[PDB]
């Protein structure tokens with residue numbers, strides 16, 4: 001549902017300022033986060049990809065081979081309201097995106113591609129929250 005996806009979004013973005021400081025990222029990535037869930041908005045900046053990668057790593061969502069860690073993704077989803085079914089459905093969407101995306105040597109671009117594919121799948125399910133919820137109050 002959009003309500004669960006809002007909560008997952010807020011919690012995924014809570015480390016954004018921490019990741020920006022660790023990576024010395026520029027403020028020109030901020031608008032991409034404010035617009036993350038805006039339908040048809042494409043993020044193209046690889047630096048925003050690096051940030052998304054870091055946010056995933058903060059939640060232990062990347063396994064030792066650079067692919068989704070299903071168990072930790074499931075645990076994250078379920079803490080914030082997903083039942084086992086929704087958790088599985090979310091993980092399957094991300095896995096499906098990993099397998100469909102044009103492959104990329106650059107992890108920041110790979111992550112970006114997976115995020116954009118995932119976003120489109122969530123819109124297709126009518127589960128997208130408001131556009132700006134990943135940021136929450138983290139940049140205020």
Ligand SMILES: CC/C=C\C=C/CCCCCCCCCC=O
Nearest residue numbers: 008009012056066067111114115
């Ligand atoms: C688990 C996500 C649920 C709600 C909102 C945002 C999640 C961020 C979507 C990006 C997915 C990152 C997967 C690629 C990680 C690099 O291997």
